[PDB]
Amino acid sequence: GADINNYAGQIKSAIESKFYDASSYAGKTCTLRIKLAPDGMLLDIKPEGGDPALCQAALAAAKLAKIPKPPSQAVYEVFKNAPLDFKP
């Protein structure tokens, strides 16, 4: 519930829900660097590597994502700046 693995999954899920036809990329990975606010708002996102095809797509999708609020101070303090592997 509070757990960081749970929350990381929810951020991935929120991005994937706005990503048109994400399965066409099944198998590649993009590492994103994301910065969220304590309410979940995306503040900033940049690629770090893995498939560059997947990156611009994931990057576009994440901008539309409804990310839920981090469920705890510690999980907030991770995702206020942190890499996240998106793997559709």
Side-chain angles (χ1 to χ4, degrees):
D3 182 70
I4 186 175
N5 301 293
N6 194 335
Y7 187 62
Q10 293 170 43
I11 303 165
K12 302 167 197 187
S13 188
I15 292 175
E16 201 173 324
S17 63
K18 301 307 189 211
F19 190 137
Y20 178 68
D21 181 2
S23 67
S24 277
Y25 297 82
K28 295 147 155 203
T29 287
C30 177
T31 302
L32 305 153
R33 190 97 205 162
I34 74 176
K35 290 192 203 183
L36 306 173
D39 64 345
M41 207 188 105
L42 180 60
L43 261 17
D44 184 267
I45 177 152
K46 259 71 186 150
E48 310 208 313
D51 175 11
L54 183 44
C55 289
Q56 65 94 18
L59 228 148
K63 286 166 179 170
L64 298 161
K66 235 281 174 131
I67 299 169
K69 60 188 177 184
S72 82
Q73 176 186 190
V75 166
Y76 168 69
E77 290 292 337
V78 184
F79 290 102
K80 71 172 167 161
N81 181 319
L84 178 70
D85 292 344
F86 185 64
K87 306 181 210 160

